[PDB]
Paper text:
Dedicated assembly factors orchestrate the stepwise production of many molecular machines, including the 28-subunit proteasome core particle (CP) that mediates protein degradation. The CP is composed of four stacked α-rings and β-rings, each containing seven distinct α or β subunits. Unlike conventional proteases, the proteasome harbors three different types of active site (β1 or caspase-like, β2 or trypsin-like and β5 or chymotrypsin-like), each present twice. Previous work identified five CP chaperones: [name] ([name], also called [name])29–34 and proteasome assembly chaperones 1–4 ([name]–PAC4).
Structures 3 and 4 are analogous to recent structures of yeast 13S and pre-15S intermediates, respectively. Structures 3 and 4, as well as the human preholo intermediate, also allow comparison to previously determined structures of the corresponding yeast 13S, pre-15S and preholo intermediates, both validating our approach and revealing conserved or species-specific aspects of assembly. Insertion of β5 and β6 is accompanied by increased visualization of [name]’s N terminus (residues 29–44) (left) accompanied by redirection of the β2 propeptide’s N terminus to fill a newly formed pocket at the confluence of [name], β4–β5 and α3–α4 (right). In structure 4, only the extreme N terminus (residues 2–8) of the β5 propeptide is visible, at the junction of α6, α7 and [name]. This resembles a harpoon, anchored 60 Å away from the rest of β5.
Residue numbers in the entry:
A (entry chain D): 1 to 124, 130 to 193
B (entry chain E): 1 to 239
C (entry chain B): 3 to 201, 206 to 248
D (entry chain A): 5 to 233
E (entry chain J): 1 to 166, 177 to 235, 242 to 264
F (entry chain F): 5 to 244
G (entry chain N): 2 to 8
H (entry chain I): 2 to 23, 31 to 107, 119 to 288
């Protein structure tokens, strides 16, 4: 009847005695150091809002791009490490241009999210050995109505209606659940 | 207390003759929602229990599509499920393209087992952490299989996996006698009744967390969600 | 300690301890000296292998020739020094084949320093524990003198010293060096004085000089009679200075 | 903490595994090498001293070319792999330049080969040091190579077990102007100084080199030389 | 602080205190379990500090249903007031920056109590041995200079082997053994250290070896070295629960 | 052997590899399988534990077929046994393709044993955890039985028994006249031995699985007919 | 498993 | 733990002896780190802080502690649904795993009944600071302490496989002065408990105060109805008798809470 | 790109200049394939696996690709320690007339380019 | 491999001891005695003889499948001592090397060349961090065209030599002392008698015809041949009488 020390979270390919790959959970926890981003989709468009958190007045404000342009009708958001999201957005843009060149059609938001997520779920030549420390938030319009999606470091995407990623995710989500309505306009 | 040195790797034998990482991976299947599968003389059906993180979200997909006659249900990790689904789709497509003949379910399952056995013996890898239920129809009739993270597969006839699946398994074992001589409506009713045992005795099997997949002789694989499962649910009794 | 096992680990305050130890391993070798004069460059060295049963093959044990215009001296581990010297000769020959002109000294030094730095960044290899001194003549800048470190760092000097007791030699050179007024004879006298202070017999030193004569570089190794005469003259002057 | 890894510098700036390899070298059978005014003599003490041994199976003194010989002191298995590579290098030099290789070039190439195993992880250094003799342009040569890849040029040396006393003995009775027979006698005496037994022609090997080329002495000649001491 | 289990502190004059150290493989703790189980000691108090991780459990030495319901904590004190022998047991791991205060408190209590001498059972890493130690016995010992005037003749007659110095001494993996020895020799307290080179894994035979080594001197059983020691009933599942089905 | 048992390429001070010993200890975590060679054939028999009534009759089979003339019975980890069965099938098929006739059993055993042993040398892989038997029958060779060990050593046997209780099974096998009986009596003897060695308290229930290859099957591996199995079960229960 | 280690 | 081919690695030690033994800047950084991880007791309702230990300023007759989300939910649904409770103070912490967060109430009808609800994680170096801040150094003679905690079923030790047990189930561990009895079997022999409940129980045992600790072993550690309902037999004990009045209201509140739990991750499907 | 490579014609890369170019460029691979096929057909699957494992283990301890290596253990295993071919005496690779940057070649060996 | 290397002066093959001793090689040497048998090889005037022990403890085994005398080539015979799987693997490797030499050079490989090639292969395993040495030793006998009978030996360290009469196993030292005593002071019948007497005197067994196995080569018949039970019994009876 003694007490000892055991370590199960120093490697990516190690299972805890109850499943629970801990490195992926730590990567997910790393998102909380970013800035809050709010996105909700409605019957006539989808909105994205995000804070900048400028560190010094000498910095040029038009250089912290927390909202980017995947294509003519698809947006994106930022939370976490900046360097990784750049190499994910590049993949998104290349895929959405290749699809047009091949088929003369616009990619679905779900399809582009799946294509992006197909890259971030493989780890452990050029592939990294650690999970991506970033969470994205797609959105736009398609042949269906406005659509909003989500993605986390584990590499899996889920459709949604109101999200909140960043430091104040819990409070923002609580307020969103309290305030949101089934069918509003782009002013409320 | 003596397990510290013998459970950090999948290529290490314990002094008792055990590999602990395989058991730890097997412990991960019980982290997902329960799914139920059963078959009859003509049809094979799959029933799953969707779960949403909160109210303002859409329930994730638990029943996937592989071929015109093969469909699966997942429980456990998601990346492993996606990789296995990609492998199965590629194998079926290649076989159809080359031989102009559907890939048999037994050969598919044997290929899955052979692929899954490899990362449990070599360094730098970890076992897959997903358990599968496969339903298909071929020249030998309806089939249903189960897959374990330890690269083991069983040719069962009515099985359920996931968290708190013991009650569903008990109900299926009790009522397996009268499954062969049944048609689709009461087969789906039996499946739903078995799945209802998982929930606490305060909830209900509403039309927002149920997914149904049906395959048959003249019927291809079909998935019903949201309002499509209404015709399969009105006939259920009370708890 | 915890951060002192590989070359690819950063200390919690930004240090590379393996590189520090590689640089510290130099301080056990012999003393190499070099001073730049008005009409030539000089090199001096210490013979650490002086035994009664040791042969006298080859020209010099620590002074090597790289091409028609450059020479070098090493201090550190001989096994790595040999590889470095061979690579230097190969680089110079490659540049000559490419451009039909002799390679500049700074380009040669940079080319070798890149190789020396490459081993301090990829894991699984051991850094080169060798420090070198370069002398030569170039048509762009004239006479030059350089120095290299195990970490891959270099710089141009006018009077430097590496090896055992480097601090005292550097201090004395800084005290007794005159800017832009050192003739070759004065440089030889200063080198003899510094070596005598920091270590005299004429069988324990090796001196080489580089000069330009009628449009062609001449690299010589001083003779035993010449170095003995220099030692005797220095001793006589020091005695007369009492 | 710094003693187990080959690619780690100690805080004092030292490599310890190479020192331990040198210690491994310093625990083998003794060897002696003396160069005279007209040749070089090499000697060593055998390990298989029992009767149950065929005298024409394995030799410690090996020829590399017509004018080059070599002997070792250290680990036996790590010796053949170097002898074969040295022979291949000599043949390559002859094929390219149409002239027998000089001793110094062969020593440099062998040292370069030996140095490679002391810089990367996953290997261990060779545990053997070599003595090389030759004759080029009417001059005798004698060299020695360390496990670390550094070579020296000697006039009279002794390595192996109990070598400091042998070196002092050689320094005591070495003469600049010496014939080959006197060198052989001195080498035999130096080997006898540390033998721990009764020395016989069947447990020592002697090799000589002169203008005629490298040659390994026969047991009859060894006995004849022994009878005069 | 020493807190009596009852209402008053028992008198301890001339007693011999023997204690473990939290070291590699828990060899000292296992040996303490063997000694306490075999000699059938009884609890007399607790040693309450804020230096060890807290833990709780039922009685680890249970022989009947009337005593298998006694709560225990990480630090406990047992005594056998018939052979002048008192023991201490630790069942946890030290928090960082909390070892030297514990050693100071323990030695203060030892000095203020009246114990004759202290014996420490520990262990050391077995992969840091040179060639000369690979050909010898894996048992070592140390003696405080205040004790060497008393039992050194007996120790020499026992043909043991004193541990090599390095002049100082370093114990690679002994935990607080070095600190305890240094503080005891500075404070002029008799002390002896018994250790053995071990490696992680099944460390029961190491415990039996160490207890036999100690019995070779203290002579607490009949001289021999056959079911002499009693294994406590808590040594049930030292490798885990069991095999999941459908795998073998 | 603590400290020297974390890799398959490490030697103990007394000169032994401990990972291989742990692998061979891992095979006694499964049920018991026995095999008896008789005058004119080879008879197999295994004890299978029922996990649930939901599995189909014919799942988790432990008696495989390599080709039309070779049987196989396994014990230990199931996945490793399946991989080894696939390897044996590949070897036999390739030999038949190159040489145009049926492969002798000794060469197949040698090939599979060497393949198993190949995993004992490197630290990048893990030794197998299953042991199995092979059997065949030919008119000009007669019955033949073989054993394979996770260490990679093979031998020829008259009677063999592997699993949890190999000692007792061998004890009752040794008191038999193997060389002067046919398959008809050997099947009953095997059933009796399996029923005797089985333990009731630890294991809830079990079902037999018997098979032979011999002269009366024209050298082909087949499953025992149901009536013979039932009468053998009745005989074993009555004798018990 | 071994053939997968190579490539 | 090998990065390249052939690196020399050392096996880990289960006794935690790897820290070895080993400037004013070092003292400054150590002091800054210590101040960053200091337990502080504050009065949340206005004011700034507190001076004397919490139990050294009030009289007590019963103390109930909840650790984990399930126990906090149980006490919120079943005990706090009736009567009026006034918050006394809260605790401010900081770990690598954290940041009702350690908030203390007491009954207004009976000012000698206290309840605690800690849903945060307290590191092993903050247990004794928590004990000193809450209890103090002059323990009262007449008190009762009940502790509730949830643990995973994989932490249990059994001859059979851990997947065969009929989880959830309860176990108990009580001090020698606890003259009452338990509603569940006591914990078996080769099983131990550590962290904060162990610290509280050890303090109570050492200083001779009646106490009892309840453990729930579950296969799901999130907010689930079955885990919360597994605590029901405690309601029949003498510890919680005049604190539970209405069951259906508690069930309705529990249903609402189970509807509004939280957002979840996307690893397990 | 377009500066780190140049003077390459696609239509002049599909057609080899000489019949002997491809055979000489890929002699070792074909020899290994033939030996492995014969060994696998004669003895079994284990022998080529062991040989390939030994080759892979030996080939993994060398100098960085911008310095010449000796390859002693590989030559001992292959058996080329007592044979001299035309690859040894013609166009010595230890005295190559061209060499690239160190970091670029190390990166190219790993496949990051 | 990504498993690294264990820390210690022993416990790894590429680590030198403070006085340059490799301990894993010595442990591999100790691994030879695990079998528990002894082998003896004696070279005569015009013949060579190999004698080794046989131990079958189980009555359920097939004695025809238990052997330690192998045939590398039609003119070369071998006897192995140590681990069985390692011995068989090394026999297969030797057969492959002999076939390759025959193909490359055009004539049968000599015994010394085969032993040297095996030793050269074995030397590599003691320098890399991936492989481990095999725990067995090999003894080869054969007839040379111009030199006569030849006896050789190899060890896990990579060291090989030619002998006149050697032994291996668990009683190697006593067998060697007996062989020196005999040699210091031989037709075909004398070599077999000498080897059998050496083994019997060392082991104190008084053998029966079913506990030993013999293989011989001669100048008249240079093909490796395994003696049978009748011949072994005849030799034993002649030795007894």
């Amino acid at each position: 009847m003694f007490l000892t020390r055991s370590e199960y979270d120093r490697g990516v390919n190690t299972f805890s005695p109850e499943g629970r790959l801990f490195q992926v959970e730590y990567a997910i926890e790393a998102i909380k150091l970013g800035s809050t981003a709010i996105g909700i989709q409605t019957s006539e468009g989808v909105c994205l809002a995000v804070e900048k958190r400028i560190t010094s007045p000498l910095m040029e404000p038009s250089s912290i791009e927390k909202i980017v342009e995947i294509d003519a009708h698809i947006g994106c958001a930022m939370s976490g490490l900046i360097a990784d999201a750049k190499t994910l957005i590049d993949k998104a843009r290349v895929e959405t241009q290749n699809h047009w060149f091949t088929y003369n059609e616009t990619m679905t938001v779900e399809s582009v999210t799946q294509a992006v997520s197909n890259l971030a779920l493989q780890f452990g030549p050029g592939a990294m050995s650690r999970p991506f420390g970033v969470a994205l938030l797609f959105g736009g319009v398609d042949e269906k109505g406005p659509q909003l999606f989500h993605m986390d470091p584990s590499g899996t995407f889920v459709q949604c209606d109101a999200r909140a990623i960043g430091s104040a995710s819990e409070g923002a989500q609580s307020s969103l659940q309290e305030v949101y309505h089934k069918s509003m306009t782009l002013k409320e | 207390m003596f397990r510290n040195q013998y459970d950090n790797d999948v290529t290490v034998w314990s002094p008792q003759g055990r590999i602990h990482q395989i058991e730890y991976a097997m412990e991960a299947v019980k982290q997902g929602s329960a799914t139920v599968g059963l078959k009859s003389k003509t049809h094979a059906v799959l029933v799953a229990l969707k779960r949403a993180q909160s109210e303002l979200a859409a329930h994730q997909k638990k029943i996937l599509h592989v071929d015109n006659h093969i469909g699966i249900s997942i429980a456990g990790l998601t990346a492993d499920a996606r990789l296995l689904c990609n492998f199965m789709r590629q194998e079926c497509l290649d076989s159809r393209f080359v031989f102009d003949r559907p890939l048999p379910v037994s050969r598919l399952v044997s290929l899955i087992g052979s692929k899954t056995q490899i990362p449990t013996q070599r360094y730098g890898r970890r076992p897959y952490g997903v358990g599968l239920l496969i339903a298909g129809y071929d020249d030998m009739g309806p089939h249903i299989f189960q897959t374990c993270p330890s690269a083991n597969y069983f040719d069962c006839r009515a099985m359920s996996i996931g968290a708190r699946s013991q009650s569903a398994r008990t109900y299926l074992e009790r009522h397996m006698s009268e499954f062969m001589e049944c048609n689709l409506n009461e087969l789906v009713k039996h499946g739903l009744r078995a799945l209802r045992e998982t929930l606490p005795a305060e909830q209900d099997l509403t039309t927002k967390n149920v997914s149904i997949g049906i395959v048959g002789k003249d019927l291809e694989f079909t998935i019903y969600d949201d309002d499509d499962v209404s015709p399969f649910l009105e006939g259920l009794e009370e708890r | 300690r915890r951060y002192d096992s590989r070359t690819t680990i950063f200390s919690p305050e930004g240090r590379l301890y393996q590189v520090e130890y590689a640089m510290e391993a130099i301080g056990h070798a012999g003393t190499c000296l070099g001073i730049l004069a008005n009409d030539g460059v000089l090199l001096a060295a210490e013979r650490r292998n002086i035994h009664k049963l040791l042969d006298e093959v080859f020209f010099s044990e620590k002074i090597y020739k790289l091409n028609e215009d450059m020479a070098c001296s090493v201090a550190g581990i001989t096994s790595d020094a040999n590889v470095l010297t061979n690579e230097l000769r190969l680089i110079a020959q490659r540049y000559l084949l490419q451009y039909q002109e002799p390679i500049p000294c700074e380009q040669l030094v940079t080319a070798l320093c890149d190789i020396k730095q490459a081993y301090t960044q990829f894991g699984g290899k051991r850094p080169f524990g060798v420090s070198l001194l370069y002398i030569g003549w170039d048509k762009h800048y004239g006479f030059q003198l350089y120095q290299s470190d195990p970490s891959g760092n270099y710089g141009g000097w006018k009077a430097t010293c590496i090896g055992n007791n480097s601090a005292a030699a550097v201090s004395m050179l800084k005290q007794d060096y005159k800017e832009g007024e050192m003739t070759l004879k004065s440089a030889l006298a200063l080198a003899i004085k510094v070596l005598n202070k920091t270590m005299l017999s004429a069988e324990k030193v090796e001196i080489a000089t580089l000069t330009r004569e009628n449009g062609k570089t001449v690299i010589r190794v001083l003779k035993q009679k010449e170095v003995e005469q220099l030692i005797k003259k220095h001793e006589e002057e020091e005695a007369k200075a009492e | 903490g710094y003693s187990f890894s080959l690619t780690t510098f100690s805080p004092s700036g030292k490599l310890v595994q190479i020192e331990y390899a040198l210690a491994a070298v310093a625990g083998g059978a003794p060897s002696v090498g003396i160069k005279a005014a007209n040749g070089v003599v090499l000697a060593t003490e055998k390990k298989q001293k029992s009767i149950l041994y065929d005298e024409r199976s394995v030799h410690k003194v090996e020829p590399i070319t017509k004018h080059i010989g070599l002997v070792y002191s250290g680990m036996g298995p790590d010796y053949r792999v170097l002898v074969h590579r040295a022979r291949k290098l000599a043949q390559q030099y002859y094929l390219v330049y149409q002239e027998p290789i000089p001793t110094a070039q062969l020593v440099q190439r062998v040292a370069s080969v030996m140095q490679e195993y002391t810089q990367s992880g996953g290997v261990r250094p060779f545990g053997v040091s070599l003595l090389i003799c030759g004759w080029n342009e009417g001059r005798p040569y004698l060299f020695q190579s360390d496990p670390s890849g550094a070579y020296f040029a000697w006039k009279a040396t002794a390595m192996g077990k109990n070598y400091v006393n042998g070196k002092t003995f050689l320094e005591k009775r070495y003469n600049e102007d010496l014939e080959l027979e006197d060198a052989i006698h001195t080498a035999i005496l130096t080997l006898k100084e540390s033998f721990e037994g009764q020395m016989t022609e069947d447990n020592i090997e002697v090799g000589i080199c002169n203008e005629a080329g490298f040659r390994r002495l026969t047991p009859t000649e060894v006995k004849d030389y022994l009878a005069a001491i | 602080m020493f807190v009596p289990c009852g209402e008053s502190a028992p008198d301890l004059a001339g007693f011999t205190l023997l204690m473990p150290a939290v070291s590699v493989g828990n060899v000292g703790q296992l040996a303490m379990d063997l000694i306490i189980s075999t000699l059938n000691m009884s609890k007399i108090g607790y040693f309450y500090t804020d230096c060890l991780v807290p833990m709780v459990g039922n009685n680890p030495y249970a022989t009947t249903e009337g005593n298998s319901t006694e709560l225990s904590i990480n630090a406990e004190v047992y005594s056998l007031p018939s052979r002048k022998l008192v023991a201490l047991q630790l069942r946890s791991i030290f928090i960082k920056y909390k070892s030297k205060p514990f050693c100071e408190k323990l030695l203060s209590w030892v000095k203020s109590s009246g114990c004759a001498r202290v014996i420490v059972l520990s262990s050391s890493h077995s992969y840091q041995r040179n060639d000369l130690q690979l050909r010898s016995t894996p048992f070592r010992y140390l003696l405080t200079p205040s004790m060497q005037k008393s039992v050194q003749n007996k120790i020499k007659s026992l043909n043991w082997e004193e541990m090599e110095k390095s002049f100082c001494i370093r114990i690679p993996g002994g935990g607080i053994t070095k600190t305890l020895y240094d503080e005891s020799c500075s404070k002029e307290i008799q002390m002896a250290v018994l250790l053995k080179f071990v490696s992680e894994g099944d460390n029961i035979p190491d415990a039996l070896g160490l207890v036999e080594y100690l019995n070779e001197w203290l002579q607490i059983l009949k001289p021999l070295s056959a079911s002499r020691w009693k294994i406590p009933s808590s040594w049930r599942l030292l490798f885990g629960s069991g095999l999941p089905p459908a795998l073998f | 052997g603590t400290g020297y048992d974390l890799s398959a390429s490490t030697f103990s001070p007394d000169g032994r590899v401990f990972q291989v010993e742990y692998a061979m200890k891992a095979v006694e975590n499964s049920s018991t399988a026995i095999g008896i060679r008789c005058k004119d054939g080879v008879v197999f028999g295994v004890e299978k534990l029922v996990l649930s009534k939901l599995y189909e009759e014919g799942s988790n089979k432990r008696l495989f077929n390599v080709d039309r003339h070779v049987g196989m019975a396994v014990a230990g980890l199931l996945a490793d046994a399946r991989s080894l069965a696939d390897i044996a099938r590949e070897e036999a098929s390739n030999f038949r393709s190159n040489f145009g006739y049926n492969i002798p059993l000794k060469h197949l055993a040698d090939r599979v044993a060497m393949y198993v042993h190949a995993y004992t040398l490197y630290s990048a892989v893990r030794p197998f955890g299953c042991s199995f038997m092979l059997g065949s029958y030919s008119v000009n060779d007669g019955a033949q039985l073989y054993m394979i060990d996770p260490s990679g050593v093979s031998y020829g046997y008259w009677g063999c028994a592997i699993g949890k209780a190999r000692q007792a099974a061998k004890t009752e096998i040794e008191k038999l006249q193997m060389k002067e009986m046919t398959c008809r009596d050997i099947v009953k003897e095997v059933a009796k031995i399996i029923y005797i060695v089985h333990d009731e308290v630890k294991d809830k229930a079990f079902e037999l699985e018997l098979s032979w290859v011999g002269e009366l099957t024209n050298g082909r591996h087949e499953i025992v007919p149901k009536d013979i199995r039932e009468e053998a079960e009745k005989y074993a229960k009555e004798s018990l | 498993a071994l053939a997968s280690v190579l490539e | 733990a090998a990065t390249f081919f052939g690196e020399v690695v050392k096996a880990p030690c289960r006794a935690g002896t790897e820290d070895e033994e080993e400037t004013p800047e070092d003292r400054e950084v150590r002091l800054q780190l210590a101040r960053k991880r200091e337990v502080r007791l504050l009065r949340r309702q206005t004011k700034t802080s507190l001076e004397v230990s919490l139990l050294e300023k009030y009289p007590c007759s019963k103390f109930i502690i909840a650790i984990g989300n399930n126990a906090v939910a149980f006490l919120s649904s079943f005990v706090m649904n009736s009567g009026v409770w006034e918050e006394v103070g809260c605790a401010k912490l900081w770990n690598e795993w954290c940041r009702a967060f350690c908030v203390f109430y007491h009954l207004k009808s009976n000012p000698s009944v206290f309840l605690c609800q800690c849903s945060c994680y307290v590191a092993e170096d903050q247990q004794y600071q928590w004990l000193e801040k809450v209890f103090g150094s002059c323990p009262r003679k007449n008190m009762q302490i009940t502790i509730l905690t949830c643990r995973h079923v994989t932490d249990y030790k059994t001859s059979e496989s851990t997947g065969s047990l009929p989880s959830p189930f309860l176990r108990a561990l009580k001090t020698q002065n606890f003259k009452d009895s338990a509603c569940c079997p006591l914990l078996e022999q080769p099983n131990i408990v550590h962290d904060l409940p162990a610290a509280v129980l050890s303090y109570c045992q050492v200083w001779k105060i009646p106490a009892i600790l309840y453990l729930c072993y579950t296969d799901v550690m999130k907010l689930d109805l079955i885990t919360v309902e597994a605590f029901k037999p405690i309601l029949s004990t003498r510890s919680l008798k005049g604190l539970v009045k209405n069951i259906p209201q508690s069930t309705e509140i529990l249903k609402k809470l189970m509807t509004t739990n939280e957002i979840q991750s996307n690893i397990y499907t | 790109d377009l500066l780190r490579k140049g003077f390459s014609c696609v239509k002049n890369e599909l057609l080899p200049s000489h019949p002997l170019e491809l055979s000489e460029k890929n002699f070792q691979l074909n020899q290994d394939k033939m030996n492995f096929s014969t060994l696998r057909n004669i003895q079994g699957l284990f022998a080529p696996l062991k040989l390939q494992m030994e080759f892979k283990a030996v080939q993994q301890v060398q100098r960085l690709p911008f310095l010449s290596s000796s390859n002693l253990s590989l030559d001992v295993l292959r058996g080329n320690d007592e044979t001299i071919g035309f690859e040894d005496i013609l166009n010595d690779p230890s005295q190559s007339e061209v060499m690239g940057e160190p970091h670029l070649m190390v990166e190219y060996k790993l496949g990051l380019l | 491999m990504s498993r690294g290397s264990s820390a210690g002066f022993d416990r790894h093959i590429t680590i030198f001891s403070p006085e340059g001793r490799l301990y894993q090689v010595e442990y591999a040497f100790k691994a030879i005695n695990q079998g528990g048998l002894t082998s003896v090889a004696v070279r005569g005037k015009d013949c060579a003889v190999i004698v080794t022990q046989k131990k079958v403890p189980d009555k359920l085994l097939d004695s025809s499948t238990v052997t330690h005398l192998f045939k590398i080539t039609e003119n070369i015979g071998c006897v192995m001592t140590g681990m069985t799987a390692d011995s068989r693997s090394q026999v297969q490797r030797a057969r492959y090397e002999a076939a390759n030499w025959k193909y490359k050079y055009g004539y049968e490989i000599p015994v010394d060349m085969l032993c040297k090639r095996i030793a050269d292969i074995s030397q590599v395993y003691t320098q890399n961090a991936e492989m481990r040495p095999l725990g067995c030793c090999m003894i080869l006998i054969g007839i040379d065209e111009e030199q006569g009978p030849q006896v050789y030996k190899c060890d896990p360290a990579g060291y090989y030599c030619g002998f006149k009469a050697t032994a291996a196993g668990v009683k190697q030292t006593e067998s060697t002392s007996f062989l020196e005593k005999k040699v210091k002071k031989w037709t075909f019948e004398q070599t077999v008698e000498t080897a059998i007497t050496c083994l019997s005197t060392v082991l104190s067994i008084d053998f029966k015809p079913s506990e030993i196995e013999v293989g011989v080569v001669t100048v008249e018949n240079p093909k490796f041949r395994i003696l049978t039970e009748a011949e072994i019994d005849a030799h034993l009876v002649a030795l007894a009488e």
